[PDB]
Amino acid sequence: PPDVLRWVELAKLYRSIGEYDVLRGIFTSEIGTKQITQSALLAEARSDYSEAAKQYDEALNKQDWVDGEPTEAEKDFWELASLDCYNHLAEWKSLEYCSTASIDSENPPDLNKIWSEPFYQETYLPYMIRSKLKLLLQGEADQSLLTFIDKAMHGELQKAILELHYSQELSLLYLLQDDVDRAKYYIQNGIQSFMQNYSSIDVLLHQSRLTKLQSVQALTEIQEFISFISKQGNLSSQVPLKRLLNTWTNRYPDAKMDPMNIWDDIITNRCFFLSKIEEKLTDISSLIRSCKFSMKMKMIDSARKQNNFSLAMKLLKELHKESKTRDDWLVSWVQSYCRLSHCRSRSQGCSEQVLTVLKTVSLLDENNVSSYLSKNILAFRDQNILLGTTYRIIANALSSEPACLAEIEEDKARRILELSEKVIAGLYQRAFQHLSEAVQAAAGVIDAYMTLADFCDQQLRKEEEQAYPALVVEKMLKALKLNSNEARLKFPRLLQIIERYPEETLSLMTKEISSVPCWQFISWISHMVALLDKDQAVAVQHSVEEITDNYPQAIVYPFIISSESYSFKDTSTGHKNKEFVARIKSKLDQGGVIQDFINALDQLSNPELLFKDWSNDVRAELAKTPVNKKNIEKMYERMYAALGDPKAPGLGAFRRKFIQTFGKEFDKHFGKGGSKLLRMKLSDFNDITNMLLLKMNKDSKPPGNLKECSPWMSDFKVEFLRNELEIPGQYDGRGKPLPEYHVRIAGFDERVTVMASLRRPKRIIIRGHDEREHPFLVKGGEDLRQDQRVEQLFQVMNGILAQDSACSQRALQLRTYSVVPMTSRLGLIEWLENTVTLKDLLLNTMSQEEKAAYLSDPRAPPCEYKDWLTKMSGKHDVGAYMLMYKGANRTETVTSFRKRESKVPADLLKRAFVRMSTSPEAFLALRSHFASSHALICISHWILGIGDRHLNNFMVAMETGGVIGIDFGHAFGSATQFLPVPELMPFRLTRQFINLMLPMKETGLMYSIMVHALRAFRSDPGLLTNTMDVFVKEPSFDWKNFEQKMLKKGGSWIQEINVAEKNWYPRQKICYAKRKLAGANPAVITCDELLLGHEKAPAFRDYVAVARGSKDHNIRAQEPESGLSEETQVKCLMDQATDPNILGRTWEGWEPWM
């Protein structure tokens, strides 16, 4: 065919530049039509290279296949994938016969036949010479190679390939036959081969250069063996031997970043080199064998981490025979096997998870009980840790699934219940004894503390429905006294166990928090200085005191906003708490420069919108019932401080260029304010305010035009040490902070830039003590604590995301812009250099006329959409959705959706990537980064369920093509609850993000990124679970700041609910996130969230019908409700994202089409 071998050659190209995902993107959509294809690629996409060839040898001998026939395009592909997925693991012996046994049989004369028919010359040859060399290097004779080598070394057309390419295999072969000089010439041609090959690759095609560069360690290891074997200065004694052995075992390839064949190359070459150098010149060899065993053991402990499991298992069964002389080898062998069983069992079913770790008991009542768990107490500790965690695994296995697990294999049921609920408590007790041995038995004890920590916290969150709270606190804090990233983020668990159990061991917390390094709390300080108002601000006083003594700069900005509200206790215990805030308030802010800093930054914003904020605040507050006492006269003082007379800027502030245009004009209307606004108590007629507010926007002058609107910062002139300012937004954990070295703010440029948004924030260009120019964006008027919280969330998120293998090898990270809330209604936020928002990219890409007909046209897809809302429902604004859901079928909406999206241009994102790249060597590495980053943030915006991802919340950076996420108002699962017209799509993957990657399918890259990300997420010990728990279990938005920040933005949402406002309940959002992280179908969660906030809504059954599926077209209904897997979860996601039953009826400003 003329349209299939093209895909064969495209796969042939993409196999060479790494890129092993868009390789598999076409082997499920062009070379297909079967089912063994998908059933093997699902076990090849995850690193499970055993079953994904065990169902290719169980498919090459197929007979019937009566549904048609596999063409000639995939019968070769099946054996080629069999070769590849035999090569990635240690199957060399079953590679040679399966390579050369496809031209003839009867042990064929493979001499010149492979030098014929060039399909027999690129594919079957390198695996043959590779496999035969790997099988020769183990040590045998087998004499199958040099005859073919010497026959092919005869003639130019049989030598100008076998000398061009390979030469390192040949260098090792001629080292095996002991002519070192031709081996010298060959390895030197190998070094020149790497140089000339490296020089011709382009400079931005990354990961191809890595696949080149990862071999020079093997090349130089051969070069060093040659340089070492020939010299006669090393034949005298054993010390250059000893030094070379130490500098070998010192160096290593790293774990978590090198694929397994490079580990194989270096390990086997080093073992053969070492055996040769002991074979020639002749305890010594016992020490040599000990270095051999330790190098092999490090190879196994690196190969465990990447889920490359079957290679690890056959390596373990390789490495048993040597492990009998020295007992530490046996104890390392058994802990390595128990840890391999542990890392395996985190993915099996509940039926086999008990079996797969019950089988590893009989080697633990084995020897090493003979006096070696007495010589080392540390090995006793590690044995205790692994056994207790194994008992915890078995007890946690069949406590999740009821009692049905002791139904099969009754000898094993007798085995487990030998050591029905009275065995669960016994196994938990047998776990707890072995863990309590550890905390009484560098940093080989932090693991022993931390296992008790997470075990006991799991037991108490089981006990939500035993003096463990006495045990957990000091056994956590005695290791937090040491450095630990896994204990820095586990502190608010102590802050909540002491609050909920104050009569349970309050003094223990005090007696341990007495001596602790007081700079390990600097990240958590808003969870301590917002605790001064309540009780239990008595166990934590001196740590706050020490921070305000030694580092009195890094507590200041969260002390202010928590001093903004503090009502103290009438009992005399409160009479030292108000004394405590008095003492710290006196001894801090002694410079008196922080307050003028904040005040001049307040005088920079636009107060014209602050009056709108004040009008909406009072018309929401006093419009219920006039029984609120004194609060109107308590909150008019805030308005009268900043606004009113032109001398209150003098006294509380500096003279503003805006107040000489605002307060000076407002006397003939603010006399009315001083008459009736100071004594209103009416709340019946704010039309008088609305008409003046309509006039105040016509003649105002928002061009502030300079820095002179804030005169304090323009003329800064630092003089000497008056306890200088120390720029906001440093001191984010991470070791002992050097105080003197942050950028002392020393100047403000007289250039300000407003931004065009709904609130119109301003951007300033502040200058450096290191003589840089740090820009920032002031954010006047809004609460910005939640954005600090979710940047902490993204920090722990892509701190998880870089310690597995399969995301570190592909370099997936989020991009965290920084944010800081100086005081309430005043935040600084980091600005990024030369970025463009997504709708601006997709909008300026077009020409003149297509943009003109998209914006200004009657049948244009916005205006056509509101016209379809009219002609479907009858009414002509919001309020027609409720009659639109029930009163419309499927087939009108789907076809009308296609009919409206056909009018826009098609190749918009591809013209945007081609209008600036100027090189098709750059188009590839500018497209792949866009797709990789957009896929990662579209799955990480969903675990903690965020909505509202419209066209101005993605920003692209036009030097690499990444995308970022900003502006999170609907943080947890709350987009669909409290909005009127809900949103049901888990992210945004619309038509343009599809027409970019054509002609590839949307299962090549945007699927493998999401799968690797989600499987990287849900195997953690619950760091995300605890942090998400703590973020909503700290009340700062208890529907009040939520509704305030909701009405801050101007959309269509005014509250009046009275049923969902009682249904806030942060024991529900953690439950739903723990479900959709623990495994749940993503149509169950969306209809559950729509049920809990839209009960008794009219078209509610329509909502659950559209979210429910169709069972004939949408896969998201044909799947179960629980116990799924990652690929099924993400297949439901990618169906629900693009399913025009859903995208047809959504919010018009969300822009579903473009």
UniProtKB/Swiss-Prot annotation:
One of its GO terms (biological process) is negative regulation of cGAS/STING signaling pathway. The modification N6-acetyllysine is found at residues 298, 317, 647, 664, 668. Keywords: Acetylation, ATP-binding, Biological rhythms, Cytoplasm, Disease variant, DNA damage, DNA recombination, DNA repair, DNA-binding, Immunity, Innate immunity, Kinase, Nucleotide-binding, Nucleus, Phosphoprotein, Repeat, Ribosome biogenesis, SCID, Serine/threonine-protein kinase, TPR repeat, Transferase, Ubl conjugation. Residues 754-760 are annotated as: G-loop. One of its GO terms (molecular function) is RNA binding. One of its GO terms (cellular component) is chromosome, telomeric region. It is found in: Nucleus; Nucleus, Nucleolus; Cytoplasm, Cytosol. The modification Phosphoserine is found at residues 757, 847, 1052. Residues 1122-1154 form the FATC domain. It comes from the Eukaryota. Changing residue 25 to A: In a lung neuroendocrine carcinoma sample; somatic mutation. TPR repeats lie at residues 4-32, 33-66. Its main location: nucleus. Residues 945-953 are annotated as: Catalytic loop. Residues 965-990 are annotated as: Activation loop. Residues 748-1079 form the PI3K/PI4K catalytic domain. Autophosphorylated at two clusters, the T2609 cluster and the S2056 cluster. Autophosphorylation induces a conformational change that leads to remodeling of the DNA-PK complex, requisite for efficient end processing and DNA repair. Residues 1-565 form the FAT domain. Belongs to the PI3/PI4-kinase family. DNA-PK is a heterotrimer of PRKDC and the Ku dimer (composed of XRCC6/Ku70 and XRCC5/Ku86). Formation of this complex may be promoted by interaction with ILF3. Component of the core long-range non-homologous end joining (NHEJ) complex (also named DNA-PK complex) composed of PRKDC, LIG4, XRCC4, XRCC6/Ku70, XRCC5/Ku86 and NHEJ1/XLF. Additional component of the NHEJ complex includes PAXX. Following autophosphorylation, PRKDC dissociates from DNA. Interacts with DNA-PKcs-interacting protein (KIP) with the region upstream the kinase domain. It is linked to Immunodeficiency 26 with or without neurologic abnormalities: A form of severe combined immunodeficiency characterized by reduced or absent T and B cells, recurrent candidiasis, and lower respiratory tract infections. Some patients show dysmorphic features, severe growth failure, microcephaly, seizures, and impaired neurological functions. Serine/threonine-protein kinase that acts as a molecular sensor for DNA damage. Involved in DNA non-homologous end joining (NHEJ) required for double-strand break (DSB) repair and V(D)J recombination. Must be bound to DNA to express its catalytic properties. Promotes processing of hairpin DNA structures in V(D)J recombination by activation of the hairpin endonuclease artemis (DCLRE1C). Recruited by XRCC5 and XRCC6 to DNA ends and is required to (1) protect and align broken ends of DNA, thereby preventing their degradation, (2) and sequester the DSB for repair by NHEJ. This is DNA-dependent protein kinase catalytic subunit. It comes from Homo sapiens. The lineage of its organism: Eukaryota, Metazoa, Chordata, Craniata, Vertebrata.
